[PDB]
Design a protein around this ligand. Sequence first.
Ligand SMILES: CC(C)C[C@H](N)C(=O)O
Length: 363
Amino acid sequence: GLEALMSSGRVDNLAVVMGLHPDYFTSFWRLHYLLLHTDGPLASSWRHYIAIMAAARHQCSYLVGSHMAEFLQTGGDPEWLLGLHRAPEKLRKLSEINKLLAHRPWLITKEHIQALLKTGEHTWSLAELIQALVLLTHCHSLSSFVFGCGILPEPPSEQSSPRDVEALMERMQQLQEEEMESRFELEKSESLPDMLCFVEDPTFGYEDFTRRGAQAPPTFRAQDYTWEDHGYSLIQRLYPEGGQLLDEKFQAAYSLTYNTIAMHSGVDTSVLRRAIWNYIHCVFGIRYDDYDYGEVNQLLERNLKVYIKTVACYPEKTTRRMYNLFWRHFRHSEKVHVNLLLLEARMQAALLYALRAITRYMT
Ligand SMILES: CC(C)C[C@H](N)C(=O)O
């Protein structure tokens, strides 16, 4: 761990907790400094305001209150802090895609892209839009992390501080050696104040209460639009400096391992980490053609699925009891490792839907 920086008092509570995984922190910090402290398509004050609009979707005052202060220090018409209605209409056009990205990314549609790029007095360019999609999804995934790790405003965490594990290690060995479609639909269908003026439709979330029965996004076959050979290449064409940083951050988190499980070392944990990843993408409708989704229940205890899904979909509702309740014999560091596995998987899914809608509009 980046111990001297964490215990120094000079970086905030969020980065202190990221310090626990230096190989991820480096990739996280590079994209953080790019989006917020590097000249780009959009003015500094716009980027902090877009971040407020995003953190407001999850009622996440840690991130809202921090980008408010930055927005003021960087210029930033204070009157925009009275509510979205006082912001330029170009920013206001982002509410719909902001809400959809945060809660139901699969509903993003080329007709949404058409509205943003519609020629008017102040139109979004593609480089401006791509930077805005990265900021919105960045701050949604950072709200998941703030809530899932119990990060306190400016201990750095309300939840983290300065046997059946062997059952699990056995199930992982057995694995390291059609109706596939059925097991995916089963996993996907399973069911488990002053910020309000920066959002529209504040009670929109995962789970439609306008319809009986729980939320089941439409199955999207991965490989129809993947990061590796569709989304990455579109972002590096429209926003070069961020595409590479996002790719490195995605890979940083998908491959981060210490070869340990709870108290055990010498383990290969990729089958377990792939289940966390592939489950969250399943909660957002993405099906991997060659993956046995039965492995999710073999490997992810039920208390871990309730937490993962709460943090991906309803981070506001995360509780200390819920954090303590799963993986009771695991190290806190590993609970944090799960959180950043899931913000990266949640962010990649929201981006991919948005990037897919942009491709469809261009055609
Ligand atoms: C338990 C898993 C979330 C991570 C594990 N500590 C590893 O090194 O891969």
